[PDB]
């Protein structure tokens, strides 16, 4: 079947319920989210709600509530087959799902896809099944996906699915094949306090335009509320040459589905069944169902479609904003169909527009296969990061001209753009979907100068800090528990209104932007300016020793927030180099001479004293006053690292530089699990993984890919391949800890994680820069 098929060599592929032997768990003493190793690649566009389903076949990983993980099958919702050969009494029916409930519904169906029967593959955005089963004579495939598209910011957003499927005969029988989806009407599934049923309605859309038929189920409630949870689901199919449909418009999830099950398990032919009855109590789904005879030799190709209106998010401090798709497709919820019968009429063009985007990498016989499966399927997180992107706050009286857009650093901690992780995970964003970049800088600019002086209490020390410092950049846009992009700096374990690395990172952000999309737009340089010079006169005034550079206090005042840094640092202090250099080169584009002096000024102190207080002759210390201050730091030249992608120059001499990362390649990589597992942290100049605090006995998964990308901006491609391979292995292969679509922020030498689902391995993009 894989003949009459494409799938790219560096799909990543798993058998269908294969169990995984290695797999790895949080390491931490508080709770932290596991949903095990059965995970998939998601379908959903941008701020739709993405649902994920797993390698089998199970639609399990819900986050159609924006910002919230909920990992539970539903059941329901699978595609199911049909086969009889002529010449024998009866045929045999089997949902395509390597599982079974575990108590009640759905007794009926036949469960339990057997093993070493067919396979998944994922190249995000697309995934694919292969079924090749010894009692399904003929053999199919699906291919699935969204339409997630580079420089396109329409199609990208649009809450809908195609499933491409593809039947082949090789045997010299004629054989009867039914292929049948079905979706439970899960209106209710969240946002609904009481009654969680009660208005469910299924009806069946017929369409019937030439060479085109389209045949739909809309699943719905009576009810005309705006409210989260209210809108609409759809799934249907697209009639083709050859092939009759058939559909059951209702049948009882919160049964034994025999209702449905008698009629397909006997010739794969529904009822077609319309009830437009509304459910008080029981869960209701749908059915629609193709069937077709199969000649000796024959293939056919038929798509089916998911769609969801789903129009409005509510966040938990109480602000309901509509999604962006409503842009497209309107706001009252009652689009599902347009959306469907749009994917239907259109998933041949998308197919090729994600080829088209895709074919510049995958074409490349210069790189690696595995490189390939993890620049495209770290991706995932794109969509599947709790993302918000907003088209009016419900209820708004004055138009406005963006749409306000948020990614989550991860669930576990649930902080929208987190300022100091987005400076390694926005990669993908400014170079793939650089108007969403630009404007969520924008956010950032617009909040430097808010002030909010109530006080909260820091997690670490239990003292009550202000929550918002003018001048101070946030360290996030707000919490979906909270008010995203209104109320910002939900993290409070320490309070970042001191920290030393955010203002850096901000102006470093800005001048990447500027970079990376050509160096012609003045205009978000001049928007941003006023945000840039006051960042880095806030945080010169950090600089209490006088050395030119701001101190670190002792404390977890940066992004490694429980690794204590003391005086001058070669993270922060390296970061406030290349911030400077960056502020000097806007402030000659902008003609503003007072700043390109003062910056300038600023810069040649720091980076002789930066010089003096940390070159060791090897690498740059980890500071000069902690007491693990000869550290080797995986991220020591972190801004370094930003100049060469914003081509600012050598801000350290290039000779120490190379001798720097050489160190870290035969120390935290090579030394550590024999370069298997990624750059850990910190390591002891004898050798030993530096165990002062937690963080430095951690390979951070963002951290590796981008000390991957310096080394290969720096000439030592096989030290950035080799760097960038263990990340891959822990996250995708066999011998790895199965993270697969849940990519973690970290792991210990033993392979246990921390934080899965997680924005910073994003990073991967850096080693696509183009120079
Ligand atoms: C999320 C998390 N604590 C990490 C460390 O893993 C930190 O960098 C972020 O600032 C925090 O919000
Ligand atoms: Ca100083
Ligand atoms: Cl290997």
């Avoid at 001479?593 to 940390?614: G, P, R, S, T, V």
Wanted: aromatic fraction near 16%.
């Amino acid at each position: 079947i894989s003949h009459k098929i494409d799938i790219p060599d560096s799909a990543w592929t798993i058998g269908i319920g294969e169990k995984f032997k290695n797999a790895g768990h949080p390491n931490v003493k508080y709770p932290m989210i596991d949903d095990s190793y059965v995970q998939g690649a998601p379908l959903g566009g941008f701020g739709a709600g993405t649902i994920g389903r797993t390698y089998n076949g199970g639609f399990s990983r819900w986050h159609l509530e924006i910002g919230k993980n909920k990992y539970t099958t539903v059941y329901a919702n699978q595609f199911s087959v049909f086969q009889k050969v002529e010449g024998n009494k009866d045929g045999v029916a089997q949902v395509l799902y390597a599982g079974e409930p575990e108590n009640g519904y759905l007794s009926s169906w036949k469960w339990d896809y057997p093993k070493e029967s067919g396979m998944y593959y994922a190249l995000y955005p697309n995934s694919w099944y292969t079924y090749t089963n010894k009692d399904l004579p003929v053999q199919l495939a699906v291919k699935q996906f969204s339409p997630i598209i580079p420089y396109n910011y329409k199609e990208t957003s649009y809450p809908v699915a195609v499933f491409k499927w593809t039947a082949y005969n090789p045997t010299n029988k004629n054989v009867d094949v039914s292929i049948m989806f079905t979706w439970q009407n899960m209106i209710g599934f969240f946002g609904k306090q009481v009654n969680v049923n009660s208005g469910n309605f299924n009806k069946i859309i017929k369409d019937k335009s030439k060479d085109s038929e389209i045949v739909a189920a809309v699943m719905g409630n009576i009810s005309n509320d705006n409210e989260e949870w209210n809108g609409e689901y759809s799934i249907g199919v697209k009639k083709v040459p050859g092939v009759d449909i058939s559909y059951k418009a209702k049948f009882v999830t919160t049964g034994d589905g025999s209702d449905l099950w008698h009629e397909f398990s006997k010739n794969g032919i529904l009822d077609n069944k319309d009830d437009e009855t509304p459910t008080k109590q029981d869960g209701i789904g749908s059915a629609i169902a193709v069937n077709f005879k199969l000649q000796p030799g024959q293939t056919i190709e038929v798509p089916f479609a998911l769609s969801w209106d789903l129009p409005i998010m509510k966040f938990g401090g109480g602000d309901k904003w509509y999604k962006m798709y409503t842009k497209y497709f309107g706001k009252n919820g009652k689009n599902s169909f347009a959306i469907l019968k749009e994917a239907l009429n259109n998933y041949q063009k998308w197919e090729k527009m994600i080829d088209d985007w895709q074919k510049p990498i995958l074409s490349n016989k210069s790189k690696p296969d595995w490189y390939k499966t993890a620049l495209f399927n770290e991706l995932y997180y794109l969509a599947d990061g709790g993302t918000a992107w907003e088209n009016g706050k419900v209820g708004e009286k004055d138009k406005r001209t963006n749409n306000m857009f948020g990614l989550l650093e991860c669930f576990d901690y649930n902080y929208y753009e987190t300022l100091d992780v987005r400076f390694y995970g926005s990669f993908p964003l400014v170079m793939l979907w650089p108007d969403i970049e630009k404007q969520v800088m924008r956010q950032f600019a617009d909040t430097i100068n808010v002030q909010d002086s109530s006080e909260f209490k820091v997690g670490s020390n239990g003292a009550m800090a202000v929550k918002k410092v003018q001048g101070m950049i946030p360290h996030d846009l707000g919490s979906s528990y909270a008010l995203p992009w209104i109320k910002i700096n939900a993290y409070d374990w320490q309070n970042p209104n001191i920290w030393k690395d955010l203002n850096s990172k901000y102006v470093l952000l800005v001048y990447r932007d500027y970079v990376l999309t050509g160096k012609t737009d003045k205009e978000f340089l001049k928007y941003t300016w006023k945000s840039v010079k006051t960042a880095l006169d806030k945080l010169k005034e950090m600089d209490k020793d006088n050395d030119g550079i701001p101190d670190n206090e002792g404390i977890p005042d940066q992004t490694y927030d429980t690794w204590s840094m003391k005086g001058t640092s070669a993270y922060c202090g390296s970061l406030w180099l290349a911030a400077l250099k960056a502020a000097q080169e806007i402030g000659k584009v902008l003609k503003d001479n007072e700043a390109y002096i003062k910056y300038n000024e600023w810069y040649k102190i720091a980076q002789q004293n930066f010089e003096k207080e940390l070159w060791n002759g090897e690498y740059y210390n980890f500071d000069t006053e902690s007491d693990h201050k000869d550290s080797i730091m995986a991220d020591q030249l972190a801004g370094q690292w930003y100049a060469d992608i914003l081509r600012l120059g050598d801000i350290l001499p290039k000779d120490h530089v190379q001798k720097a990362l050489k160190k870290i390649y035969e120390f935290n990589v090579m030394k550590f699990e024999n370069g298997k597992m990624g750059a850990v942290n910190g390591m002891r100049p004898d050798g030993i993984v530096d165990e002062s605090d937690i963080q430095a006995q951690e390979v951070w998964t963002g951290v590796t890919y981008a000390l991957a990308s310096f080394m290969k901006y720096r000439g030592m491609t096989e030290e950035a391949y080799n760097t960038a391979y263990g990340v891959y292995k822990m996250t995708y292969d066999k011998s790895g800890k199965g993270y697969w679509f849940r990519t973690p922020e970290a792991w210990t030498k033993d392979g246990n994680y921390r934080a899965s689902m997680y924005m910073r391995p994003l990073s991967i993009w850096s080693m696509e820069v183009n120079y």
